[PDB]
């Protein structure tokens with residue numbers, strides 16, 4: 207009956223409300239995806255329960271145990287009925303789960319502490335270290351690129367010691383902030399743009415996006431919800447709600 | 463034409479109509495994914511991102 | 521659409537230009553009739569091409 211929604215504590219998509227300990231259920235959270243979940247649920251006619259993914263990961267298949275972790279795993283093993291999060295539509299995921307059309311368009315980008323202007327720049331040097339989220343579509347983009355500059359970047363990143371990979375986006379952001387310009391972070395343009403509008407306003411997005419892709423609402427392969435969820439995403443985009451929500455969470459409340 | 467539904471006859475024209483009435487098996491073109499179309503035909507994930515814009519003479 | 525606009529902007533007589541930002545954000549998709557045997561495979565093929573970098577390659581080829 208009640209749809210279990212798996213999501214991730216990733217700002218500004220889902221965050222704990224300042225007074226969450228005094229609130230119950232869905233009311234404990236706020237964010238772009240919290241606002242989107244309420245709307246998808248109204249338009250699809252279902253009751254839901256927001257739950258934060260237990261391992262705090264997006265979703266990758268372990269080469270070895272072949273088990274899917276993160277939000278993708280929760281859907282694959284039936285622990286959740288739908289994922290409403292900044293989950294990237296990728297070929298490997300689409301093979302095991304269904305995705306609505308994109309609710310947000312984006313691409314990999316470079317985040318620097320306020321002398322690097324591009325991925326080519328990062329590749330040609332070694333003083334400034336750089337990495338990605340330890341588990342996610344960004345790390346996979348590099349591990350599989352056949353493009354020279356990106357393959358060179360991957361060769362470096364995968365062998366860098368200490369590790370240049372981070373467990374969460376917040377961790378990558380803090381590393382950039384505390385490294386005196388000696389660490390650049392590769393992350394999705396959406397997260398980059400958000401952080402650029404957050405105090406202490408010491409980071410910046412540089413260069414163009416490395417690729418073009420989108421985030422989609424995910425459901426277990428063959429779910430009853432897929433069709434309606436997809437139609438809802440298309441309707442909300444055409445009406446302008448998605449743009450409204452991005453403005454609300456990225457720029458209207460910007461601190462810089 | 464790309465494809466729109468006649469308000470009167472409810473008949474689809476353009477590439478959309480060709481798919482709807484079985485004249486073509488697939489449309490590979492700059493065909494925009496929309497709610498009205500998604501109701502009558504299937505669309506793959508996007509191969510290109512875009513938005514409406516304004517073209518002016520310099 | 522921004523796509524046609526920016527293409528024309530880079531073609532003689534070079535007398536037009538795109539002004540302002542896009543009014544919305546959407547995408548183009550390969551379409552098939554409802555229940556088509558091709559639907560599933562074409563969708564996965566689009567995802568493969570984007571990830572291989574082929575779509576960006578074709579875009580630069582025909583625009584830039």
Ligand SMILES: N[C@@H](Cn1oc(=O)[nH]c1=O)C(=O)O
Pocket residue numbers: 264265292293294295339341342343344345375392393394397
């Ligand atoms: N949305 C990404 C997670 N992730 O966020 C980034 O900024 N990079 C990255 O891999 C995914 O779905 O795997």
